[PDB]
Every structure is written in structure tokens, then in C-alpha cells.
């Protein structure tokens, strides 16, 4: 059962945020140059309050949230977002993450209805399902949860990082790389997406990835501690050319 429940955008500065491990190869004590879809440094990221519009997916999405009450539960990814095409639904409940790809007929304004227990009010039907996956929760001071969503050659790739945050209303400064979470062999197009919130009877940020060249610094324990955006400015370009921070 669906229930029928526009402000200007706010912006924040993704200072040096949204960098993920480009592959699963171990490297240490080395500067590695790679080209991939990354969030540009110091970009203007759209700030929403958990206000739940349908957004473009473009070439991939950087999604971050700051909350202490688990309001954001999942995402809807697809094109038409109705029964005409296959759509990807990712939701997290108290014990498991449920991922399905079906011809969903989504509600005009989808959400989870929380009374402890909850009822899903996301879609009225789910026909011709092609993919299903179940595992441990993706989501489970304030908690900062960062995700990167890519869709390349039929594979929906998710990267994530979870840290404590002590800021009031913005993104933190400093470097933290996101690790691979899951790689789903789905084979569908994604052009638009929407966020699923838990509403009882928190804010998030959305940025977009670009084909950028990065210089990644791996420390002695094989983790990334810094990075240079080679197209940010003339100094960063010099640093990349000489492979030297």
C-alpha cells in the first residue's frame, strides 16, 4: 500500500573526499597513478535534509550521510522507475541487506513506515524478477557513512566507509579511502535514483564522479593516506608529472 505524503539546493565542499581503492591488488610504500571515475577535489556537493527528489545518476554517485538515528535505509536505482523496466532496489533492515532487481511499480513517494517493527511502502508490485542478493547490513557523536555507486559493463559496484564524526553540519577534512563492499552482476541501465528514508508514525550529500587521473599514496600497511587530483590546478598537475607529493 502506497501513501502520498520544492526547495532550492544547498552546497558543501567535498574537500578531499570520495576516494576509493581502484582495485583489489595489494600495494604498499608506493605512489600509484590511476585513471578512473573519482569525485573531483573541492567540488560543490548537493546537501539534502532527511526533501527526497529523484536525482540523476550520471556516471556514478558519491553518497554520504551523517546521522545517529538510522533514517536512511536504502536506495532506488533505475531509469523509468516504473513497471516498464528493470529497477534495482537496495534496502537495509535490522538484520540483513536485501537487494532485488525486478519490474517494480514504485510509489509516488516511497518510504519505510516505522512503528521496532516496520512496513515497506516502496512499491505496489515486483514482476519478472531477475536478480536477488541477501547479506549483512551495509549501514549497520554521529555516524558518517560514505558510499560510491558505479555502474560499469553491467556491474553495479559499491564502495563504502564508516567513521565517527563530531561536526554539526558539514563534511570533515582529511583523507579516508573507501573499500569495496559488493559487486553485483545485474546487467541493467541506471540514469536516475532516489533515497529511501525511514519515517516514524539526519542529512545526506550527493556528488558526481568524473574521469579523473589520481596519484594515490600507499603507506607501509597498504592503505591510502593521501591523493592528488591531477586536474585540480597547475601545482597538482606538476605533482602528478613528477610523481611526488
Amino acid at each position, epitope marked *: 500500500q502506497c501513501v502520498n505524503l*520544492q*526547495l*532550492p*539546493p544547498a552546497y558543501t565542499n567535498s574537500f578531499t573526499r570520495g576516494v576509493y581503492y581502484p582495485d583489489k591488488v595489494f600495494r604498499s610504500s608506493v605512489l600509484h597513478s590511476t585513471q578512473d571515475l573519482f569525485l573531483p577535489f573541492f567540488s*560543490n556537493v*548537493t546537501w539534502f535534509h532527511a526533501d527526497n*527528489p*529523484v*536525482l*540523476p*545518476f*550520471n*556516471d556514478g554517485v558519491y553518497f554520504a550521510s551523517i546521522e545517529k538515528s538510522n533514517i536512511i535505509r536504502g536506495w532506488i536505482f533505475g*531509469t*523509468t*522507475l*516504473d513497471s*516498464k523496466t528493470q529497477s534495482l532496489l537496495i534496502v537495509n533492515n535490522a538484520t540483513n541487506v536485501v537487494i532485488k532487481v525486478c519490474e517494480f511499480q514504485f510509489c509516488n513517494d516511497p518510504f519505510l513506515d516505522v512503528y521496532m517493527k516496520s512496513e515497506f511502502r516502496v512499491y505496489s508490485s515486483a514482476n519478472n524478477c531477475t536478480f536477488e542478493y541477501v547479506s549483512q547490513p551495509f549501514l549497520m557523536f554521529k555516524n558518517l557513512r560514505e558510499f560510491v555507486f558505479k555502474n560499469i559493463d553491467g556491474y553495479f559496484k559499491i564502495y563504502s566507509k564508516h567513521t565517527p564524526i563530531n561536526l554539526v553540519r558539514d563534511l570533515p577534512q582529511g583523507f579516508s579511502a573507501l573499500e569495496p563492499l559488493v559487486d553485483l552482476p545485474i546487467g541493467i541501465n541506471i*540514469t*536516475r535514483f532516489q533515497t529511501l528514508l525511514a519515517l516514524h508514525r539526519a542529512a545526506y550529500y*550527493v556528488g*558526481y564522479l*568524473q*574521469p579523473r587521473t589520481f596519484l594515490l599514496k600507499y603507506n607501509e600497511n597498504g592503505t591510502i593516506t593521501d591523493a592528488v587530483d591531477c586536474a585540480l590546478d597547475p601545482l597538482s598537475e606538476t605533482k602528478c608529472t613528477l610523481k611526488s607529493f
Partner: antibody
């Protein structure tokens, strides 16, 4: 809240050039692709050009391809159209728009400006 | 290039009449058709997307359906405020195109 304002119209001579611009506000301009559409007096709508959100790929209608250039500056929330070798047949009202598109731009909302008149004579 | 056409080029109807407008494509464009309504002096307004999905704020008297190469736009009961030129647009492939436009007059 959402506005699109065209400017740079006016009267030019055949073989000349004119640079149009569109100021965007009230929405996340830097996340959306943008279109130019023109409408000659007494005629229907004609699609002119499309540019992706990152200012990367550019597409043109056959009738303007090779003469018109589409560009944007996401730091100024401004869309541009540079028209060279203008012909008498290019007389039209030019609109900037964010057209609803479930395949290419991923736009869920449809926005249009008021349009600016370009006359070639 | 996918070429679009519409029929009739113009029609006259009175208030309460049912009005149907046909849009066709030279190529199969599945369901990726937009319908616009333009009044003189104003920019076009989107009424229907994805062939049959109504835009928020659009009166329930408007509807549409179809797929492939043959689409229909319908007004179940024409109102005096519905006198406008209607255009169909395909966005299945670039370049995007608009149809000739169907002019609805007041009988």
C-alpha cells in the same frame, strides 16, 4: 524558485556570429545536462544541441552541426551557445531547457526559459 | 535520425468533446516519447513522459498510450483552457526531435 534566463539576442548580418547565454538558478545546474531548442516565427519546435553535465560530450542537430558550438561553465551556472556563419534561416527564438529524459541526461524535471530572439538580416 | 510526424495537422473541437492526436515515429522508439503543450507567447509545458506517465499537476482529463512507432494523446473532455499546440518528442536517440505540432482550435 527555478529560473532559466536567456540573453545575448539581437540583430546580426548573414555570415556573422552571435554568442547566446543562459543563467541558471534554483536547481543543481552542475548535475544536469542541458539542451538548446529554437522556434522560428510561425513554426514548431526545433532541437538544436545537447551538452552533458560535465561539459564533456556534445551533440548537435544536423542543420547546425559544424557551425554551432555548445559549452557550459558550472562555476557560474551558465550555459552558452556560440553561433557562427549565421544564415537567414536561423532566425528564431532560442530557449535553454532541462528536458525530462529517462535515457541520456537522467532528468526527472522539465524546465524552460523564456527564450531570446535572434534575427539574421 | 528518427523522424517524427503528427496527424491531424489541426483540429477543431468544442468544450466537452473528446480530442485525439496521433504521433508516429519512422523508427521504433519503444516508449520514450514526451508530450508538450504550448500556448502562444509561452515556452512548452511537459504533460506526459515515457509515453503514458502523467506529470505532477497535470489534470486527470489528460492521458496517453502507445509504443514502438504509434502513439496517441487524448483529452477525455476538452476544456476552454486546453486550446494550444501539442507536440510529441522522441528522446530514444540523439539527435532528439519534435513532431510538426498539432494545433487544437476552439469550435
Amino acid at each position: 524558485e527555478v529560473q532559466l534566463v536567456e540573453s545575448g539576442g539581437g540583430v546580426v548580418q548573414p555570415g556573422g556570429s552571435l554568442r547566446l547565454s543562459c543563467a541558471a538558478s534554483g536547481f543543481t545546474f552542475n548535475s544536469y545536462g542541458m539542451h538548446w531548442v529554437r522556434q522560428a516565427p510561425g513554426k514548431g519546435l526545433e532541437w538544436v544541441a545537447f551538452i552533458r553535465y560535465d561539459g564533456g560530450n556534445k551533440y548537435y542537430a544536423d542543420s547546425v552541426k559544424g557551425r554551432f558550438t555548445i559549452s557550459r561553465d558550472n562555476s557560474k551556472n551558465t550555459l552558452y551557445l556560440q553561433m557562427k556563419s549565421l544564415r537567414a534561416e536561423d532566425t528564431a527564438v532560442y530557449y535553454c531547457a532541462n528536458l525530462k529524459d529517462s535515457r541520456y541526461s537522467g532528468s526527472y524535471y522539465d524546465y524552460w526559459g523564456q527564450g531570446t530572439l535572434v534575427t539574421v538580416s | 535520425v528518427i523522424w517524427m510526424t503528427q496527424s491531424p495537422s489541426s483540429l477543431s473541437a468544442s468544450v466537452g468533446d473528446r480530442v485525439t492526436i496521433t504521433c508516429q515515429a519512422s523508427q521504433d522508439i519503444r516508449f520514450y516519447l514526451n508530450w508538450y503543450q504550448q500556448k502562444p507567447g509561452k515556452a512548452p509545458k511537459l504533460l506526459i513522459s515515457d509515453a503514458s506517465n502523467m506529470e505532477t499537476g497535470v489534470p486527470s482529463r489528460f492521458s496517453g498510450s502507445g509504443s514502438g512507432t504509434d502513439f496517441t494523446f487524448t483529452i477525455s473532455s476538452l476544456q476552454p483552457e486546453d486550446i494550444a499546440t501539442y507536440y510529441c518528442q522522441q528522446y530514444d536517440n540523439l539527435p532528439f526531435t519534435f513532431g510538426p505540432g498539432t494545433k487544437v482550435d476552439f469550435k
